[PDB]
Design a protein around this nucleic acid. Structure first.
Length: 55
RNA sequence: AUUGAAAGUUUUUUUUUUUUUUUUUUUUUUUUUUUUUUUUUUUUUUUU
């Protein structure tokens, strides 16, 4: 799950071609009792309010 | 209807004066407002 999306303010077609874009995919929500399950990457690295098993 | 009677025991006099329920007697002696809690996590100084 992508962590930060925001809005598209600049275009870099080289990035869009080298790496496959996926605008459909959303983002992880939180680590509170509401929606505690997260994407594996968010669980590994970190998320808002969930720390990083890694540094 | 008496031997036969008609007389207030009355007038007058303050139970009054002297004397602070008073002196001494600290509602104090002791008791730490402490005690467990990371201002922490998420974010590539960056493109036509």
């Amino acid at each position: 799950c992508y962590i930060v999306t925001g809005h598209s303010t600049s275009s870099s077609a080289v990035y869009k071609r080298i790496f496959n874009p996926d605008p459909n995919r959303g983002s992880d929500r939180f680590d509170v009792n509401k929606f505690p399950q997260v994407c594996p990457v968010c669980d590994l690295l970190g998320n808002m309010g969930l720390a990083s098993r890694v540094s």
